[PDB]
Design a protein around this ligand. Sequence first.
Ligand SMILES: [Ca+2]
Ligand SMILES: [Ca+2]
Ligand SMILES: [Cl-]
Ligand code: NA
Length: 297
Amino acid sequence: MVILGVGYFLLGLILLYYGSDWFVLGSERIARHFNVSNFVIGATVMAIGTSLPEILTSAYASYMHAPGISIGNAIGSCICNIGLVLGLSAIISPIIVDKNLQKNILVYLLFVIFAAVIGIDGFSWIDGVVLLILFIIYLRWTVKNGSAEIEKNNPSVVFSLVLLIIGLIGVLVGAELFVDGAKKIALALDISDKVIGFTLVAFGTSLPELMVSLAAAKRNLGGMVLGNVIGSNIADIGGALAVGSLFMHLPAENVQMAVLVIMSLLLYLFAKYSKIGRWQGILFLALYIIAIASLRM
Ligand SMILES: [Ca+2]
Ligand SMILES: [Ca+2]
Ligand SMILES: [Cl-]
Ligand code: NA
């Protein structure tokens, strides 16, 4: 059963690779269909789609009386999205942020700071309710500001939705096969360790974002990348973390929240006063490496 683990592992990689490109291509077409920016489609449809693992994971974990895993994933994902995911993407395709997209990033920063402050004493179910509402407000605010009001079953639209949906299924299934495949290899080789069993799943929920953003970066879709990262973080907090708090009070993670706030602030400052390019990406990656080397497992 080690061969089937390798089977799942490689097949997961194949589905992630091609699925992410299809998802990106389908999303880019849908953006042009609805007359919205790539940032908007990245921050809404793409972000929610790729944060489905986090939401399910956080909800399940907190339900199973493991609220540390719930908030643990979620904040961990946010750090991964800025540090690793945006870091790699910025180097591949440097981004100069337009003024009204800078506005969206600022709102994101305020959201993260607000979440951090109310999370100092942990996250109650009331905290979750508030975050979820802000999450909803953010989505509507984002769509409208990035929408161009203008107006059968056109083959261009249908094929667009097919690419998106099948692409999304490809990255989600691919991510599961990757994790399950790796988990069965490790079990077959008796090197299985649940202390690292969670870093495999935590990173696993971040695999769709990683592959999607890289694919978009390869096609110079910087707005989509930034949208995906910003939207996924908010979805991780206002969605994944929030739902977790509904089942059980989530323990405070003040160190990790502080790290996220600092990384979010840096992201805003770079977007506002400079660019998100090679050296900003290098800094993000360096910080991420420092985080995974120092933060508690
Ligand atoms: Ca995810
Ligand atoms: Ca609280
Ligand atoms: Cl773009
Ligand atoms: Na996401």
